[PDB]
Design an enzyme around this catalytic site. Structure first.
Site, mmCIF file in Angstrom:
data_model
loop_
_atom_site.group_PDB
_atom_site.id
_atom_site.type_symbol
_atom_site.label_atom_id
_atom_site.label_comp_id
_atom_site.label_asym_id
_atom_site.label_seq_id
_atom_site.Cartn_x
_atom_site.Cartn_y
_atom_site.Cartn_z
ATOM 1 N N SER A 127 0.773 -1.252 0.000
ATOM 2 C CA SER A 127 0.000 0.000 0.000
ATOM 3 C C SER A 127 0.819 1.327 0.000
ATOM 4 O O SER A 127 1.485 1.610 -1.009
ATOM 5 C CB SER A 127 -0.835 -0.171 1.259
ATOM 6 O OG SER A 127 -2.138 0.447 1.150
ATOM 7 N N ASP B 89 -5.795 -6.236 -5.526
ATOM 8 C CA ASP B 89 -4.431 -6.464 -5.067
ATOM 9 C C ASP B 89 -3.580 -7.035 -6.192
ATOM 10 O O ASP B 89 -4.020 -7.901 -6.950
ATOM 11 C CB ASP B 89 -4.424 -7.411 -3.864
ATOM 12 C CG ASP B 89 -5.159 -6.839 -2.660
ATOM 13 O OD1 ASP B 89 -5.353 -5.606 -2.601
ATOM 14 O OD2 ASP B 89 -5.539 -7.627 -1.766
#
Ligand SMILES: *C(=O)N1CC=C1/C=C/C(=O)NC(=O)/C=C/C(C)=C/C=C/[C@@H](O)CC
EC number: 3.4.21.92
Lengths: 179, 181, 178, 182, 181, 181, 181, 177, 182, 179, 180
Positions: free
Chosen positions: B86, B160
């Site tokens: 992230s 993701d």
């Protein structure tokens, strides 16, 4: 902490780092900082990393592995007590010929662990990644031990214990420390 | 907390090395800002070295680091060890061009922003709008630093997406891989 | 339970909506309406309402049942009828909606919340607004107010006394005494 | 752990830099007041720099800082990094006119005061009446520092409203955006 | 609760079953028992299944589906309130020409969810199974709705809300029950 | 809540027993009681055991197995939803030719699970018993399915999923129940 | 809260005195290893004194101390004060021949290893086989340092056994008793 | 009536789960009830239990031996600690195991906190219980007291065929008639 | 809050004063053992002064102190202030003969050992037998230091027994009472 | 804890603070401070500020016996409140050197306790707490000048005393208003 | 639970009462209600109280004791499993000649237990009370068993277990039930 500046600091001045307990981002980053520090003081003298760990996070352990390979000094690994999962991986990543087990040490190897919750699409993404890691790890273990990839694959499917003399024959360590 | 003859993280701060470790949040990030501002004052010409090993964290906290990296005179070189997910991946790519690095077995995961809110429907619309603007600005900055198109960053961050050390140089997140000294 | 007592009043076609509105208590209300219909599809049903609010979907399963069944559903508000309880109060058969003299009614817009990715956040926020739009439409339909007025009066909690509810259009009259 | 050089924050304090991070509350805010009083005593004419990265906090705690910024002779330059929401946005705009700054990707959030009370309807009226006055003074002070009318501050704060750095410049909360050190 | 005896029992004499709340082994087992019981009383008369559910376990939901398809009587499905995850599956699995929504019903469809912890080998085993389930559910969706397999997949990757009229146009149900007769 | 007419009791007069949820000593003892009761009423009529379970205790499940084999009437097993661990074992223990899956049923098999704490001497005792149990379970599985003992051992070392058609080709089930008469 | 002068334990370390107190585990044992390695560096020829007051702990952690005592050149004299049970009793007898001691009212307790594992029967067999190997090796080393036969160590450690200070002499755990200086 | 009750009119009692004072009294009450209805017909006690309290279990044992009717014991699933005790206490020749039933036996467990004097009192009682418990086992199984002592020091599992050899049970039920 | 001078307990340690405070356990007892060994090293002639204020604790932990008290050369003087119960009351009486003291309003409490174990009857007999051996040696040592008979210590510790400062000098636990200094 | 410490800097002035409830550990340090100050100068007075709501009896009595044993006079100052054991130690100060502040509050009551166990053990512990009650009343009567029968009647239940009420009753000698 | 109707009630029609588990105000009141009911149905026929209890509150147990002695019917006591503290007291309180133990039953006796928190004055009040109880329980035990008050005192100071045969010689029970 036998104060004086505890005792672990006294032995850091002798290029000895202790890897103890579960491996995780913070204790591992602390090991990386010590290895980077010792390199700066003298990039030619070997570093000595004692390992007594029951395992830990893969990412955290690999931050140590890449640092061991990156710094000029050789990192000698010594297993006392036990070195399981990533502790065994970092034990075998030591400089060739300078990896050691103590007579009554203990080593366990197995495949990676993981888990995920979410949508099936996300499950596929994360499942395919941990397998990529398993392949990455078996390849690296096969490289450092001298075993074939297929052999590492069969012996890591389930937990496998090796004694100190068994750890030399399989190739994780070079010899046993005596005297 | 090992010590020399005075703590280890402080000793490496004299060599201009900063560690970004763990979850990203206002306080650990403000501490990173303070170290960057400090190193700049002692020597603006010399590069700064930011090691990144983080599984993610708050956007606001991370942007306090990002804006500080770009604002200060010295170049901030970013080094990914272990993983950079992230915001950790975002700050990794914000390093000076030509000085972004991954270690051989590092990992970098990327995804879209996360959020949540409870309250009145009117308030939900306000926060839903803002989180979408945040998503837009991040993809724009992501595209700017990687050289990718905005449309590609949009495609690749919806879900993701893990990336290896060599995959991160191909995609453009980092400039090269550090392999031995 | 004095016993059963809610059943003895069910033979007189009396249903009680009490407490928080949720899927299970609402399904029980739907079942009673279907049962009373079967007993006599021509006669009125009497729904007492005392609720501080609850889920919309659960409440709308009751609303859709009242409109579908042949018998008219007369609504009586006792104590209070807030959020979703107030919606069902005004959904009663035109001319057969009632408040008691010291009842209370509260209206407001829908509540909600979600966690997840921004893409998923956008989907659910766009849905709750669709829901907000429909209820305001139905509220305007049953009260006679304009859609613009329902929007302005429901942006924040608004309390209405029993007489204030007859002027606003939520209910038709007040039951005082027999 | 906090690196040494004394603390890291202690040397940037010698550089007239104070950091306001996290929830604002009586204790962390009182520490900010202590640092401001210390810098004024060392040199009243040199400016003070207050970095702000906060999601909000207690009003009373925030106002102890506001009155201290307004009370001391030195100008307090405020820098918003990350975000400046509720009370953090108020202290940001209370900085010395001409010396309030946002970073390029900062985010500012404003909204009306929040509160709560349990007790006597009599006591409820007392506390509900005080929080409305606080809202009144808060809006007036915001209108004073931004140049916006009191009527405008009231409408924009009824519900949460986010402002980007350039939007914070146009609305009047901040004077300019710091991008690269000159 | 109201012992008329029991209201849900009296409505069962009229061939009405209620699927309410989270679908799971026990509440679902009761629905199977009711369907098997009603079939024995009369294999020709239809059965009416009201659906108000926010989702639940697939395996539990599939025990109802296979029972609906196996028994002779047609099972008419009525959606009141909402019908999400397995509730939307059982709603559309009703008899072709006998599936209904109420005017203000709400339907939500999405792909399966799951999770597992263990060895990477075991993860591969379970992650492959949930993908098999996803394939069969989408196939069954295409069968009962008339949509293509490719279309069900593209619309179920993320949460998708359908209004009562939208569910008719999409093929989830056949018509909307508004005012009886 | 249970819809009265009880409903499981009204189906108990049709010789239908439901095995639902985690199998354990108390729910299993009740299954034995229903089988013994039905046997007493008529030892010549077949019994119908629906199975929807994610697994449970071995001893509790084996109390059902031995009861199924001891009574005179044939016990037909029907898998609806899923039949995992011991639930799958009892499915295959049904009377020859009377074991069924529903079209979208799921069967799961794996090896026994266990655990123990104590002195090394006691650890060996319990580790040896579960290995005996594991050996006996594989033998019974091989007997009822027709597979070899070597094959069952390969297929139970780790979780293995079988669809309804995979369960007939393996020997777990005899055929699939699709529609009625 | 140790009393300062250095600290009390450090001022006592300058005399080659190490304290093993409380339950044995990876971290407290690692510090003991560090102290032994440090004292060896200060003087490889002078003896080291290890006081032991412990009710037991982890075997692996305790063996890291055992291997260190045998690895360093200086003799490690062991003194038991209070009690020395499980791994504490093992390290007590691993001291240098002739220099193992008990105080007059010390107490020693010996017993076989304890352990536990949860998982698949296959994994159970793996871990049960390992704890038995450990039991075998620990019994072997105990027979070595006490002079007792392996059978005797096995037969006396199957269950908890307590030894007084004089009993620990005639058993071989300790060489003599320290009474007055 | 009920399923456990419907089978009670055919003299079948179920001992299920942990043995404790309350579930055991239900077993005692059913035996006394059955006895009153017909003191000659046999009683049928199915056992699937992992153990429980000794005193509670001994309330069942003494009642089985006291009542006129023979109490036949049938083990389904497993019958461990006291459950194994009551299985073996059934009327001779009418004790049974199912083909895949399991049996576990071990010595008594206990514990106490307090003064050393009180510790001695309770430790002396549990050794007296252990003695009487082993004595009863030797009587019903035919084993010697020395053998029971050796085999109960630690947990010991017996299969259905091993239970007939050891003497815990008389025969194995496979199929009815 | 740990007053400084240097620390305070460290300043009184240089004066050969050790404090036994609170519950007795392996770690606080090991710290007391270390101080006694240290003071012996500084001067094996001067006496050591052990203040005792404790409600009891583990026996093994207390016996590590007892054996250290008797093993080292210097005399260990014991002073009871406040209370000295079970293990505190033994260490009090185990002090050097003629140098055991109670303060005027001190309290001493004695009783037999407490314990407990769960497990198999065989294991219970082992631990029940062992605790009775401990009780025996404790009564033996108690009788030796007090001058009482072993049978008397037994009859007096079967149940709790409180002793005042004057009662403790007659019973033999302590030698005299310190009322005022010199 | 501002500055080296502030309580340590006032300790050089011979000022000890008894704050919070009294228990074995906090009392041990007051004993340590008293013993230290005695060693530094056995002729200068010691100053014990008291603001405590009570505490354990034994812990408080270790302070009492220390106050009376050492040579220097221990002056007591009550600020805020002095309840249960806090009130006892206030009155135990050297005669003529016990003080209250104008709005300090003193509260006294009888001992509290409790026990679980056998009836025989119940008799022993109930018998003992009554002995404690007997002494405490004796000492309070001794230091205050009140009669024993009066201390008993007034401590059977919670009794509050103002600063001026405390001088008449005898707990303290005078009141420090200003200076 | 086995609805014969009900099992414990079916045996209450045979004048059989079960005292099971801890003794406390509510379970004891249920026992008192059954005794008063059985007395009403037939004041002449004996009542049968099976006892398997590890102890409980004294006052609650004494509500049973006073009821057994007050009602005209004799209460025969049956000890199955164990009869500890108050369970042993009520076992021996049965009508003389009609107290029984099963072959492997277990009786445990000890003195009263208690506890209190509060002021020292209140501590003495409750301490004096539990001792008055302790003295009164020992008196009745001596009355029903035939032992001396001094023997009951010595033997209840600490936990003492008695086997089924030991209970007949001490006087706790009259004989042992073995067959029928
Ligand atoms: C004497 O103490 N020993 C000989 C055998 C023993 C056993 C001692 C024991 O169990 N001791 C404790 O753990 C005592 C704990 C207590 C009484 C703690 C009190 C703490 C205070 O905070 C109470 C006010």
């Amino acid at each position: 902490v036998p104060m004086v500046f505890d005792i672990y600091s006294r032995l850091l001045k002798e290029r000895v780092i202790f890897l103890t307990g579960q491996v995780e981002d913070h204790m591992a980053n602390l090991i990386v900082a010590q290895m980077l520090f010792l390199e700066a003081e003298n990039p030619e003298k070997d570093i000595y990393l004692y390992i007594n760990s029951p395992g830990g996070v893969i990412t955290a352990g690999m931050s140590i592995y890449d640092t061991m390979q990156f710094i000029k000094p050789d990192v000698s690994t010594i297993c006392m007590g036990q070195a399981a999962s990533m502790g065994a991986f970092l034990l075998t990543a030591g400089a060739k010929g300078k990896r050691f087990c103590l007579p009554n040490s203990r080593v366990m190897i197995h495949q990676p662990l993981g888990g995920y919750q979410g949508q099936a699409t996300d499950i596929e993404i994360h499942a395919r990644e941990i397998l990529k890691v398993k392949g990455r790890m078996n390849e690296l273990m096969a490289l450092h031990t001298g075993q074939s990839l297929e052999q590492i694959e069969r012996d890591t499917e389930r937990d496998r214990f090796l004694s100190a003399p068994e750890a030399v024959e399989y190739g994780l360590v070079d010899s046993i420390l005596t005297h």
